[PDB]
Design a protein around this nucleic acid. Structure first.
Lengths: 555, 412
DNA sequence: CAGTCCCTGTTCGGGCGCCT
DNA sequence: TGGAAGGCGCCCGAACAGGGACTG
């Protein structure tokens, strides 16, 4: 008879499936001595038992040395058990952010020791855990054991742990409504507005409560001592910061280098404002292998330079004060890159961040601004449960023009203009009505599917005309191309009739940037015009000169 | 006390697994309190990560309500229970409800809380309350009774419902009563006073039978249809005639009698857009004949109960929104326009949300079904804002379209 | 008409970062 | 050495998925 700590959690295998059978890795006696060591320890504590041949299951175990630590870390690879283990609904919905914590008089950070190992596994599942234990090389076939608790490396361990832990803490919290406990994995952040004494008291009460359930709180706890190391941050009484970020100086740059670099810069962007990853990532496009080594472009080097400069200065975030409004301000960084700062008191930042994403083949600054606002809103809701008041580099009138005229539903929540160039503008506006006294260009283009050869051209009410042969092209590109010609060959005010739905659809959305050079040139021309009216008519209806450019560009 | 009607999933279909979305603090608070009281009452009970299933939850306030209501997005669950409610225990739909001079909507969802739920089914009602800034992990529950907004719920409670109603039906033979999900729709031709009066009566009946009503008023005989119209101008330009022809061209996809030839003739040459051209007799004739065809009913369009309703919405600017409900392309069961809704001239998303709810409501009164929406908005835009504006206890299906308007067919 | 092509949006999987 | 879990973020590219015009 073994004893029973705390309520268990029913587990199962994906129906009609059975436990894992695999033999181990050839291992040095290094790893094996680092193993049998802690192997023989658990038996007494109750964290394992032994099995005969009765237990037809086999899984590997080998050890990895603790980072910044003395003793070795034992990790079982359950991958073949995981694959066959029931799916769980993960209760961990995201990572807490320092910027979302409120000011607290007294603060403590505790770890539950050997946390996974303090939680009873499920009775009838225990068997499936079976691994084989090495004496040493060539020595002995070994001894096979089974977990009575949650194994490091299973796939149900985190969820059951987090859920059980919650169940235990719940009553302590119901009795202490004013204490704040951030519970993340086995890490605990307790904080209170109590005086540091009554606080140390209540912390003790809590350690004892966790004890009643067999959960140990060793003295690796941070007691009064700021800064607390929590979730990769340092928490001081009035400020927080990221723990120092070491960027690689490597003279030779490979692909995986660029990756580690960018990942780190992204991590940094939560606090250091203005980080830019665009040029750097440009380097990673369509590469052969993670090992391949590429040189930095002038463009990438300049960027990396100003990021290292950004990183020169130390910076800190503050905490969140519900009595005060939330505020997010955005700056346009060029090339479709955006930065933002969320704060409450001017200049004291809760957090910062960036939005770089390019959506669509054709876009503009107003759309991308909208996208950023949404990214920021959702992020804000996760952290503070509310939407920031926005400060945006876009004239109120610009925005009113865009959202009212656009065919999609579009909206930004409460916001105000901040005049902080570069401002976001619409670069041209299509007329709502045909222009009196402007030359009307009936434009057309067509391509041959086989030859991929085509023509693009136009005819005018003034008798003006053009046709141009094009090679290796599409119907779409030629429709665009006809419009382009009409723009080039016309004065400052022009009417243009097209039967292309595609072409019209792109231009009417007033793009300022494209993945297509031809659309970019069309944009360039649209920006130079004073007045442009685009109109659509159906094809083959022999409409206007539109049958006569229709019969012109097939010729 | 009660015996639980067993329930199964549609053949060969796993339960719902849908990630909870972030909630605002006001909403998480309202949910934590609502749920606390519901647990004290045995209606739901806490569960654990062993249960693989999850459905999103959030909170809303009905129009003018001020009281938080819990709302579960059971759309996935319902799609996976579909044969149970459609085929087996389902509800017959009165074709007179749309004809009644007035129809009030009442929230009866509370009643579903009486009946136990099949024990082996509950694992599927799983939902997770999240926390601000991920302070705590998710608090998972599941329903021990009939959940509000599940399609199975008004099915299993049907016998009990008619049981409670039979007195009122006998008493008032003419009043029509429909049940859709958490709602009861009550129509009559009585004048408004008589009406509200009788609805209070029905309230009493529900109260003494063990239910509460914390309804909306509708007027279907007043519901309007939006025809396709052609402009009347004293003089026409090349551009006017081009727009007209493109419109008539699109229209013929619907009414095949439309003809563009006499009108296209006036467009023969390459002319200035702003140039005025007079209409030939043949063009005048073709045009008026066309204006007549657009008065006629479209041919061979009738509702088919076995088919889904699709609804399309267009943003017309200036607070105008046009829509069409259809089963087959170009056969429109209904067309409409809405103006000056909440959010007009200020919030597109709020107006769209309002429009989606009005349209869905008419769909329930008319066919007793909700349409699948084609929404003129970016997925992320809608998904960030919609639950802020949602005042209804059901959620329709939707997809997102981007459809520039070469022609404005549906609004002058 | 069914079947291609263009084209343009979405989703998914795989890499890195960071936490336990 | 080379090696486990779950969570969240980014960036890319390859794949699927669908609308609208042209063609057998």
């Amino acid at each position: 008879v073994p004893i029973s700590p705390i309520e268990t959690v029913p587990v199962k295998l994906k129906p009609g499936m059975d436990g894992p059978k695999v033999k181990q890795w050839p291992l040095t006696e290094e790893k094996i001595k680092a193993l049998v060591e802690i192997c023989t320890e658990m038996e007494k504590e109750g964290k394992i038992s032994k099995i005969g041949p009765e237990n037809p299951y086999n899984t590997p175990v080998f050890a990895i040395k603790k980072k910044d630590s003395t003793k070795w870390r034992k990790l079982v690879d359950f991958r073949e058990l995981n694959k066959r283990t029931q799916d769980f609904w993960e209760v961990q919905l995201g990572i807490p952010h320092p910027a979302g914590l409120k000011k607290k008089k007294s603060v403590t950070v505790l770890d539950v020791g050997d946390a996974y190992f303090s939680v009873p596994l499920d009775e009838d599942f225990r068997k499936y855990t079976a691994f084989t234990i090495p004496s040493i090389n060539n020595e002995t076939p070994g001894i096979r054991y089974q977990y009575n608790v949650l194994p490091q490396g299973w796939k149900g361990s985190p969820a059951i742990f987090q859920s059980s832990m919650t169940k235990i803490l719940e009553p302590f919290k119901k009795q202490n409504p004013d204490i704040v406990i951030y519970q993340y994995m086995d890490d605990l952040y307790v904080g209170s507005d109590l005086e540091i004494g009554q606080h140390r008291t209540k912390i003790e009460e809590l350690r004892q409560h966790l004890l009643r359930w067999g959960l140990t709180t060793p003295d690796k706890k941070h007691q009064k001592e700021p800064p607390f190391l929590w979730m990769g941050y340092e928490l001081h009484p009035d400020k927080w910061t990221v723990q120092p970020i070491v960027l690689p100086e490597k003279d030779s740059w490979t692909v995986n280098d660029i990756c580690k670099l960018v990942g780190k810069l992204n991590w940094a962007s939560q606090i250091y404002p203005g980080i830019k990853v665009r040029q750097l990532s440009k380097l990673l496009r369509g590469t052969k292998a993670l090992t391949e080594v590429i040189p930095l472009t002038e463009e990438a080097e300049l960027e990396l330079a100003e990021n290292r400069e950004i990183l020169k200065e130390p910076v800190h975030g503050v905490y969140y004060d519900p009595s005060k409004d939330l505020i997010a301000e955005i700056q346009k960084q060029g090339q479709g890159q955006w930065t933002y700062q969320i704060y409450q008191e001017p200049f004291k930042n809760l957090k910062t961040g960036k939005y770089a994403r390019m959506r669509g083949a054709h876009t503009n600054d107003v759309k991308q601004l909208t996208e950023a606002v949404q990214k920021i809103t959702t992020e804000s809701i996760v952290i503070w449960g509310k939407t920031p008041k926005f400060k945006l580099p876009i004239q109120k009138e610009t925005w009113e023009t865009w959202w009212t005229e656009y065919w999609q539903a579009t909206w930004i929540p409460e916001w105000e203009f901040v005049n902080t160039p570069p401002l976001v503008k619409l670069w041209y506006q299509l007329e709502k009505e045909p222009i009196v006294g402007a030359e009307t260009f009936y434009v057309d283009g067509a391509a041959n599917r086989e030859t991929k050869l085509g023509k693009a051209g136009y005819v005018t009410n003034k008798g003006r005309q053009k046709v141009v042969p094009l090679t290796n092209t599409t119907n779409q590109k030629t429709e665009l191309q006809a419009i382009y010609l009409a723009l080039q060959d016309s004065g400052l005010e022009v009417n243009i009739v097209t039967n292309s739905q595609y072409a019209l659809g792109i231009i009417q959305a007033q793009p300022d940037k494209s993945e297509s050079e031809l659309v970019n040139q069309i944009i360039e021309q649209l920006i130079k015009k004073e007045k442009v009216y685009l109109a659509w008519v159906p094809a083959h209806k022999g409409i206007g000169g539109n049958e006569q450019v229709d019969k012109l560009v097939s010729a | 006390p009660i015996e639980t009607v067993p329930v199964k999933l549609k053949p060969g279909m796993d339960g719902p697994k849908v990630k909870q979305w972030p909630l605002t603090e006001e909403k998480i608070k309202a949910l934590v309190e609502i749920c606390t009281e519901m647990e004290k009452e045995g209606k739901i009970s806490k569960i654990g990560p062993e249960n693989p299933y999850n459905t999103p939850v959030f909170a809303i306030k009905k129009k003018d309500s001020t009281k938080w209501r819990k709302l579960v997005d059971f759309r996935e669950l319902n799609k996976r229970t579909q044969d149970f409610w459609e085929v087996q225990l389902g509800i017959p739909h009165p074709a007179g409800l749309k004809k009644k001079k007035s129809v009030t909507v009442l929230d009866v969802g509370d009643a579903y809380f009486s009946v136990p739920l099949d024990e082996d089914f509950r694992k599927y009602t799983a939902f997770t309350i999240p926390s601000i800034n991920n302070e705590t992990p998710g608090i998972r529950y599941q329903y021990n009774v009939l959940p509000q907004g599940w399609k199975g719920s008004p099915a299993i409670f049907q016998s009990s419902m008619t049981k409670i109603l039979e007195p009122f039906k006998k008493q008032n033979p003419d009043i029509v009563i429909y049940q859709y999900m958490d709602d009861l729709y009550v129509g009559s031709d009585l004048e408004i006073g008589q009406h509200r009066t009788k609805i209070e009566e029905l309230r009493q009946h529900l109260l003494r039978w063990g239910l509460t009503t914390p309804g909306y008023e509708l007027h279907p005989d007043k519901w309007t249809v939006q025809p396709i119209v052609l402009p009347e101008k004293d003089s026409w330009t090349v551009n006017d005639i081009q727009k007209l022809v493109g419109k008539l061209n699109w229209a013929s996809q619907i009414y095949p009698g439309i003809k563009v030839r006499q009108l296209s003739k006036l467009l023969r040459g390459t002319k200035a857009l702003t140039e005025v051209i007079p209409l030939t007799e043949e063009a005048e004739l073709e045009l008026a004949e066309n204006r007549e065809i657009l008065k006629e009913p479209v041919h061979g369009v009738y509702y088919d109960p076995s088919k889904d309703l699709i609804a399309e919405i267009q943003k017309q600017g200036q607070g105008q929104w046009t829509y069409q409900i259809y089963q087959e392309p170009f056969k429109n069961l209904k067309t409409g326009k809405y103006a000056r809704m909440r959010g007009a001239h200020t919030n597109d998303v709020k107006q769209l949300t309002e429009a989606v709810q009005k349209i869905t409501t008419e769909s329930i009164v008319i066919w007793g079904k909700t349409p699948k929406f084609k929404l003129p908005i970016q997925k992320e835009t809608w998904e960030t804002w919609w639950t802020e504006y949602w005042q209804a206890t059901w959620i329709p299906e939707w997809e997102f379209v981007n459809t520039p308007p070469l022609v404005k067919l549906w609004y002058q």
